[PDB]
Design a protein around this ligand. Structure first.
Ligand SMILES: CCCCCCCCCCCCC/C=C/[C@H](O)[C@H](N)CO
Ligand SMILES: CCCCCCCCCCCCC/C=C/[C@H](O)[C@H](N)CO
Lengths: 251, 59, 238, 285, 285, 238, 59, 59, 60
C-alpha cells in the first residue's frame, strides 16, 4: 500500500514510504486531437527520448528556511533532447510527472508543502516597477523566499506569507498539492496535465506553472542526530509534441 | 411560434412562465439562471487510488 | 397601433434584471470551445476544500508562519488549555480570511455543518492523546477539562494515522444564521485539552506543533449576495 | 407551437439517523498528506436524527454569482473648452480599474462569456458668475473602435462618420442605452493572469497587457453648443452572461496598486487577539 | 401556425493526413499563362496531420459585408436669415460624396438592393451677445422629390403641401426617423461605372452622371420662429439589404477628387524598404 | 391597453441593428431580375484569385513596372540571397495593396494557409534550380542557404512547366492572428537562394527576372469587420 | 399566425428564434444574414479544358 | 404559449380573461385575488367534545 | 417595430392595481413553509367570535 514504482522511458523511480498520487483535476495527460487543433503541419513525437525523468539540483533544508520555487518550463531547457527540441520549434505541448524526495530519521520533525500553481504571475518589490526575467527563474537553480519584506530593483517581493502573489499562503491548498510530514512519508508525487487557454504555445515566452516548496513546521532535531537534510526534485514530461520547425533560436 | 414554457422558482414545505426569442443572435438571449450542477470531487478527491473513508488512509 | 399602457417601473435601470438586448455585432463567429481541465460549476465546490487556519493570531506573529502553528510540549501541563475560539465562520479574525470565510463574506446568510481537521507534526516517537470539545451557546466557555467534557467531543489518539476530524453539527433554532453574527445568532465555541500528555524518549525534541484545517460539509449553503468589505480604493486606476 | 422545458432543482443532502457503535471502522482518522479532503458527516461521529433538508444551492452557482451589473469606467467631457481634448472622452477597454468587479473575476484563472453593456450619462451646468440660458436637450455619441481603426483628433474629425464602427446616439431624459456583445477573443478563453512576456527573448512587456487588445471607446457631445460651459459624465457597466470559468485561485489579500500589474505591499494574515485561549464573556448579569 | 426553417452553416474544409511520397504526380508544377489559379493545399506539399476545422465564412458574405449604416450627406440650415435660401437644405441623391461607403460599393461593377434610410438631426443656439429665450421644441420637415416634381422656392412655398410626395415630420427629443426604400431604377441593376456618353454623337456628359437621376431631398424647420438665430444640421445614413452584386473590380488606390468623375493623381504602388533582402531583427538580448 | 415596460436601449440608433421599417413607397413594382454573368457571393472568392506582388519595393522604383520584377543572372552568385520578406499579409508594404491584403484590411482577424506562385520569365534556353524556404518564428532570419535549408522548403527546377507553388501552412498557437500584427502574433519569413545557378548558351541574354503571385487557400477566413485606413478625405464632395 | 422559427448562430466544440412579418411590402423585411453559399470556380478556374492538378499543366 | 384562461368576477340574478407570465421568478407574479376558502371552526368551536346545539350544553 | 397606440391611463400609479414587475433579487431561495397552528383565511372568521359588550357606558 505504501510501496510504489513509476517507469518512464529508460528511467524508473521506486519508493517505500509514499502516501498516494495526485492527478491534478482528475485529468491525465494526452495528445492533441483533430477536432481541437489549429496548426496544420504534421507534428513530431519523440516519445522516449523526451518522456523520462530529469533530476534537478538539490537544496539544503535548514532550521531557518523560508522556501523555494521553480518555473516550468525553462527549468528543463538544458536537459538533453527535450531541451534541444524546445530550441528548434515554435510550438510545444506536454504534461508532467513531478516527484519530490526528502528522507529523515524517526527522531527528526518537520512539515513541507508541495504545490503546483498554474500561471503564477508575480509582483515586484518596487510597487511602480517591473520584474526582470532573471528574478523569476535561474534555470535548474531554485529561487528563494524571504522571511521579511524585500527591497531592490527589478526583484520579486518574496516575503513567504504572501507567496509573491498577494494572497494568503495558507490558501494555496486550492491548487494541486501534497504534504511531506517527516513522521509519515518521505516523498510527494503530482501528475499535471497541459493547462492553457490555447492548444499549443511557445515554450520560451510563457511559464506554464510554478512549483513551490514551503516549510510550515520548521526542521528540528536533538543532541547528535544528523544535521544535513537535503530535498530533491525529479520531473518527467509526458505526451510531448512540437510544431513549427525552423532554425534554432538563441537567448 | 417557438415559445418555451418552463417552471418558476418556488419554495417547498400557474407556476410556469413563457419566453420568446426575438433576435437573430444567441448572444442576445437572457441569462441562464436555472442550471444547478456540481462536481466537487474534482477538487476535494483528486487522488489516483480510491480512499474508502471507513478504512484507515495508510497501511 | 395596438393600444397599450405603461406601468410603474418603465425606463429604469435595475442592475440585477434579465432582459433581451440587440447585438452590436450581427452574425459574429466565436472561437470554438476548448476542453480545459478544472471547470468550476458552483462556489460551494471551493468551500469544501480544506485550508489552513491562523489560530495563533497574537501580537508579534501576524506576518510570520508561526501564526499557523499551535504549540504543545511534554511534562505535566494538564491544567493549561491548548486553544479555544468562537464559531463565527465569517466574522471572527481566526476564520474570515480562509477560503470558507472568503466565500461567505460575499453573502449574508449561511447554513450547514463544518469540518475541522487536526494534524500532529511531531517526531515519529512522540505519543499522546487530546480532547477536542465543542459547546453550543447559552453558557460561558468552559474553564477546565471537566466542564468541556460535557459537550460534543472526540478523544484523539496520535498514531500512524496523523489526522483527526472534529465535525461541528448544525444545531440552531433558525434555518440560517447571519454572516455578520450577533448575540441572537451565536453558535458556541471550540476548546482543546490534554487528555493524557506528551511522552518522548531521550534524544528527541520536547516541543511540537499541531495544525488545523477548516472546510464545509455536504449540507452547506449560503444566500443573499452582497459586496465584500475586504477590498477598496480611493480613486480610479487601481 | 409550444415546447415544455423541465427544470431540475438540486437540493442538499439529508442526514440519516444513526445510533451507538463499537467497531473497527474509523471514519474520523485520516491523513492530510495525501492531498485528500475528508468526506465525513455528523452521522459518522455522533448520534443523529433523520432530517429532510430542503435547502438549495441556487444562488451560489457561477451564473447567479456573476450576472450583475458593475461599474468599470467613469469619465468627463465638456461642451466648450480651450484645450480641444477636453471636449471628448476616450479609454482602452478592460475590467481592471474598479476593484470590486476585478477581484470578483480574479477568483478564476480563465473565463469565457458574453456581455451586456449599459451606459449612464449625466450633465451639469458649470459654476460661473453668469448663469441662466435656454438650451435644447443635449445629444451624445458613443463610438467603439477595434484595434487598427482610425483615431479621432477632435470633435469635428471626419472619423465620427462611423461608416463601419458601431455607434450609439442618445438624448438626455430617456432610458439608459444598452447593447450586448459576444465573446470576442483570438483565444479559446479570456485570460486573467499571464506569467510570460511579449518578446521571444524573455523581455518587453510582462503579464496581462500582452494579451488583451480589445479596442477603445470615444464619447462626445453632438450639439456643438453651450454659450455657457457645461460638463458631462459617462459611466460604463458590464454584466456577463452565458458564463464558463476554469481553475479557481485564492482570493486577493493585499490591496491593488495599479491596473497593469499584480504589484502589492506586504500585508498581515489577519488581525490579532489577546491570547490563543481568549474568548469573550457574553453571559453576565 | 408555425413553420420551421432550417439554416445550413458552411464551415471551411478540413486538412487530411498525408505521408511520404515518391512518384510522378507533380501537384506543385503549374503554368500561370493559362489564366488558372492553382488549387493546391498543404497536404500536397508537406506531411500533415488530420485537423477538424470548425471555422465559418459567415462575416465575409456580401450581405454581412454591406448591411451597416453609413453617412452619405450632411447639411445645415437656419431658422432666420436674410438670404432666403439659407432657411432650407436640399441636395441630389447619390452615394458619392463620402469616401468610405463609395469605395466599399465600388468593388463591384453592378449592384442591386433595397435601402433603409435613417436621419440624424441636431440643433444649436447661434453665437451672439444677447442669449436666453424660451422656445418650444423645434419641428422638422423632410420632403423627397422625384425628378420632374415642382421645386420649392422658399420656406413658405405652396410645394410643401406634399400632396403626393412622401414627407416626414419630426420633433426634437425623439428617436431618429427611419424608412425603407425599394430598388428603384429603370435598369435591371444600379451601375457604379459607365464608360459611355449621354449623346449619340459621342459627346455631352461622360460617365456616371448620365444614368443616376433619382430626385432630390429638401429639409426645413416648421415653426417659423426664433427671435434669436439658431442652426440645424441634418445627416443621412444608408443601409442596403437584400443585396446582389456582379463583376468584382480591383479596389481604389488613388484618393478621390470629385463626385462626378473617376479623376485621380498618379500614386505609387506601395511604400519602400531598404533592400530587396531586408528583414528586421527582432530576437535580440 | 396592454401593460408594458421599456428596457435600456429604447430610442437609440445602433448602426448594425436589423429591424423592420415602414415603406415610403407602398406597392412599388420593381424591375425584373436579369441573369448577368459573374455574380459574387462571398468576399473570400476574391481572395483566392492570384495577384502580382511588388517584391522589389526599393527607392526609385515605386512608380515603375520594375517594382514587380525580381532579378537573377548567371555566374557564381551562390552567396547572394535572391529575396526575403516577412509573412504579414495585411501590414507589410509588400502585401498590403494586393487583392488579398486589400480584403484583409477591412477585417481584424485572419486565419488560414497562403499560396505563393513563382514564374520564370527567361529565354527558353536558360536552365537553373532555386531553393524556396519558409521559417516559422522564434529565431532570426537565416543568413545562408545552409540555415534556410532547415525550414519548410521546396527545390524548384525550371523547365517546360514554368511555375512553382510554395504553400505556407497554418502553424500557429492561436486560432487567429491580428491583421495589425505584433510580436505576439508573428508568423515568420520567406527567403530564396540559388540551388545550382543559371546557365545559358552563347547568343542569349545573361540577366532574367522572376515574378511572384499571392493568393489564399481553401481553409482561409477572416472576422471582426472594421474601417480601412487607405481612404480618406478632408471635406465633403470628394 | 404565419410565424417562422429558425436556429440561432452559435459556436462549436433554446437555440432558435421566432419572427413575424408586419408590413405588406417585402422591402420592409429585415436583412438576410444567414445564407452562406459560394462558387469560387467562376473566378479561379475559368478555363475550357479541365486541369487535373496532379498532371502537368501543358503537354 | 403557456397561457391561462380563467373566469372573471361577475354578478348574479366573453366572461373569461387570459394571462401570460413574463418573468423567471414567481415573486414577480400578480396577486392571487380569486381564492375564497374558510375554516371558522378553528376559532369558534375549539372544544374536545362535540356540542350538538339542539341538546343542552351541560348535563 | 410593431405599431401601437397609448390609451388614457398610461404612466399613472393606481394604488389598487395588479401588474407584473421585475424582481430585484433574481433566483432568491426562500425559507421553507412551516405549518404553524391558527391560520386565518377570511376576516369574517374573526367576526363570528363572541366578545364582551360595554353596555354600561355611563359617566364615571
Ligand atoms: C456602440 C457602443 C459599443 C460598446 C462597446 C463595448 C465593447 C467592450 C469590449 C468587448 C470585450 C469585453 C468583454 C470582457 C473583457 C475582459 O476579457 C474581461 N473583463 C475579463 O478579462
Ligand atoms: C421622406 C423621406 C424619404 C427619403 C428618400 C430617400 C430616397 C433615396 C433615393 C433612393 C435610391 C437610393 C438607392 C441607392 C442609390 C445608388 O444606386 C447607390 N448608392 C449605388 O449606385
Amino acid at each position: 500500500d505504501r510501496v510504489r514504482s513509476i517507469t518512464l522511458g529508460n528511467s524508473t523511480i521506486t519508493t517505500q514510504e509514499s502516501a498516494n498520487v495526485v492527478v491534478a483535476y482528475g485529468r491525465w495527460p494526452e495528445y492533441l486531437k483533430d477536432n481541437e487543433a489549429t496548426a496544420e503541419d504534421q507534428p513530431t513525437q519523440p516519445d522516449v527520448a523526451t518522456c523520462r525523468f530529469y533530476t534537478l539540483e538539490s537544496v539544503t533544508w535548514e532550521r531557518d528556511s523560508p522556501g523555494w520555487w521553480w518555473k516550468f518550463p525553462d527549468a528543463l531547457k538544458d536537459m538533453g533532447l527535450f531541451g534541444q527540441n524546445m530550441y528548434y520549434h515554435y510550438l510545444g505541448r506536454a504534461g508532467y510527472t513531478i516527484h519530490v524526495q526528502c528522507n529523515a530519521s524517526k527522531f527528526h520533525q518537520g512539515c513541507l508543502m508541495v504545490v503546483c500553481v498554474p500561471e503564477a504571475e508575480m509582483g515586484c518589490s518596487q510597487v511602480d516597477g517591473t520584474v526582470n526575467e532573471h528574478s523569476l527563474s535561474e534555470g535548474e537553480t531554485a529561487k528563494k523566499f524571504a522571511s521579511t519584506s524585500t527591497n531592490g530593483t527589478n526583484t520579486v517581493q518574496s516575503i513567504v506569507t504572501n507567496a509573491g502573489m498577494g494572497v494568503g499562503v495558507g490558501n494555496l491548498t486550492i491548487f494541486p498539492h501534497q504534504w511531506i510530514n517527516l513522521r509519515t512519508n518521505n516523498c510527494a508525487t503530482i501528475v499535471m496535465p497541459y493547462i492553457n487557454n490555447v492548444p499549443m504555445d511557445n515554450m520560451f515566452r510563457h511559464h506554464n506553472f510554478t512549483l513551490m516548496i514551503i516549510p510550515f513546521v520548521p526542521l528540528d532535531y536533538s543532541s547528535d542526530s544528523s544535521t544535513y537534510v537535503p530535498i530533491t526534485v525529479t520531473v518527467a514530461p509526458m505526451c510531448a509534441e512540437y510544431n513549427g520547425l525552423r532554425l534554432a533560436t538563441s537567448l | 411560434m417557438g415559445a418555451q414554457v418552463s417552471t418558476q422558482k418556488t419554495g417547498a414545505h400557474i407556476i410556469h412562465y413563457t419566453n420568446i426569442n426575438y433576435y437573430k443572435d444567441a448572444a442576445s438571449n437572457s441569462a441562464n439562471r436555472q442550471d444547478f450542477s456540481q462536481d466537487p470531487g474534482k477538487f476535494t478527491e483528486p487522488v489516483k487510488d480510491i480512499m474508502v473513508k471507513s478504512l484507515p488512509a495508510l497501511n | 397601433g395596438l393600444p397599450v399602457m405603461n406601468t410603474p417601473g418603465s425606463n429604469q435601470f435595475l442592475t440585477s434584471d434579465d432582459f433581451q438586448s440587440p447585438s452590436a455585432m450581427p452574425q459574429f463567429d466565436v472561437t470554438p470551445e476548448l476542453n480545459i481541465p478544472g471547470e468550476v460549476q458552483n462556489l460551494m465546490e471551493i468551500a469544501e476544500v480544506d485550508s489552513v487556519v491562523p489560530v495563533n493570531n497574537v501580537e508579534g506573529k501576524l506576518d510570520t508562519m508561526e501564526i499557523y502553528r499551535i504549540p504543545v510540549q511534554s511534562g505535566n501541563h494538564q491544567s493549561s488549555q491548548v486553544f479555544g475560539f468562537q464559531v463565527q465562520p465569517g466574522l471572527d479574525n481566526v476564520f474570515k480570511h480562509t477560503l470558507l470565510g472568503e466565500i461567505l463574506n460575499y453573502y449574508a446568510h449561511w447554513s450547514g455543518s463544518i469540518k475541522l481537521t487536526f494534524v500532529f507534526c511531531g517526531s515519529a516517537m512522540a505519543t499522546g492523546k487530546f480532547l477536542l470539545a465543542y459547546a453550543p451557546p447559552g453558557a460561558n466557555a468552559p474553564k477546565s477539562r471537566k466542564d468541556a467534557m460535557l459537550g460534543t467531543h472526540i478523544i484523539w489518539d496520535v498514531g500512524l494515522q496523523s489526522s483527526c476530524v472534529l465535525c461541528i453539527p448544525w444545531i440552531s433554532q433558525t434555518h440560517y444564521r447571519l454572516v455578520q453574527q450577533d448575540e441572537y445568532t451565536s453558535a458556541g465555541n471550540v476548546t482543546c485539552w490534554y487528555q493524557t500528555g506528551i511522552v518522548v524518549p531521550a534524544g528527541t525534541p520536547t516541543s511540537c506543533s499541531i495544525m488545523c484545517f477548516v472546510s464545509a460539509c455536504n449540507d452547506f449553503s449560503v444566500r443573499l449576495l452582497k459586496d465584500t468589505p475586504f477590498i477598496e480604493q480611493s480613486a480610479l486606476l487601481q | 407551437v409550444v415546447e415544455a422545458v423541465e427544470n431540475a432543482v438540486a437540493r442538499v443532502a439529508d442526514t440519516i439517523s444513526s445510533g451507538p457503535s463499537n467497531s473497527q471502522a474509523v471514519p474520523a482518522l485520516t491523513a492530510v498528506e495525501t492531498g485528500h479532503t475528508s468526506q465525513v458527516t455528523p452521522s459518522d461521529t455522533i448520534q443523529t436524527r433523520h432530517v429532510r433538508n430542503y435547502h438549495s444551492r441556487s444562488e451560489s452557482s457561477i451564473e447567479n454569482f456573476l450576472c450583475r451589473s458593475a461599474c468599470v469606467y467613469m469619465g468627463e467631457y465638456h461642451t466648450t473648452n480651450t484645450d480641444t481634448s477636453k471636449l471628448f472622452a476616450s479609454w482602452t477597454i478592460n475590467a481592471r480599474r474598479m476593484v470590486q468587479m476585478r477581484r470578483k473575476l480574479e477568483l478564476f484563472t480563465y473565463v469565457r462569456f458574453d456581455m451586456e453593456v449599459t451606459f449612464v450619462i449625466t450633465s451639469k451646468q458649470d459654476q460661473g458668475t453668469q448663469l441662466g440660458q435656454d438650451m435644447p436637450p443635449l445629444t451624445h455619441q458613443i463610438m467603439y473602435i477595434p484595434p487598427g481603426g482610425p483615431i479621432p483628433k477632435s470633435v469635428t474629425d471626419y472619423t465620427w462618420q462611423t461608416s463601419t464602427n458601431p455607434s450609439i446616439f442618445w438624448t438626455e431624459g430617456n432610458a439608459p442605452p444598452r447593447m450586448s456583445i459576444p465573446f470576442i477573443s483570438i483565444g479559446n478563453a479570456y485570460s486573467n493572469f499571464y506569467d510570460g512576456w511579449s518578446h521571444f527573448s524573455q523581455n518587453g512587456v510582462y503579464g496581462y497587457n500582452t494579451l488583451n487588445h480589445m479596442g477603445q471607446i470615444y464619447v462626445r457631445h453632438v450639439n456643438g453648443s453651450s454659450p455657457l460651459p457645461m460638463t458631462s459624465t459617462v459611466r460604463m457597466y458590464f454584466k456577463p452572461k452565458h458564463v464558463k470559468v476554469w481553475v479557481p485561485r485564492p482570493p486577493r489579500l493585499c490591496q491593488y496598486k495599479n491596473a497593469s500589474t499584480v504589484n502589492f505591499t506586504p500585508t498581515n494574515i489577519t488581525e490579532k487577539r489577546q491570547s490563543i485561549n481568549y474568548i469573550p464573556e457574553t453571559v453576565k448579569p
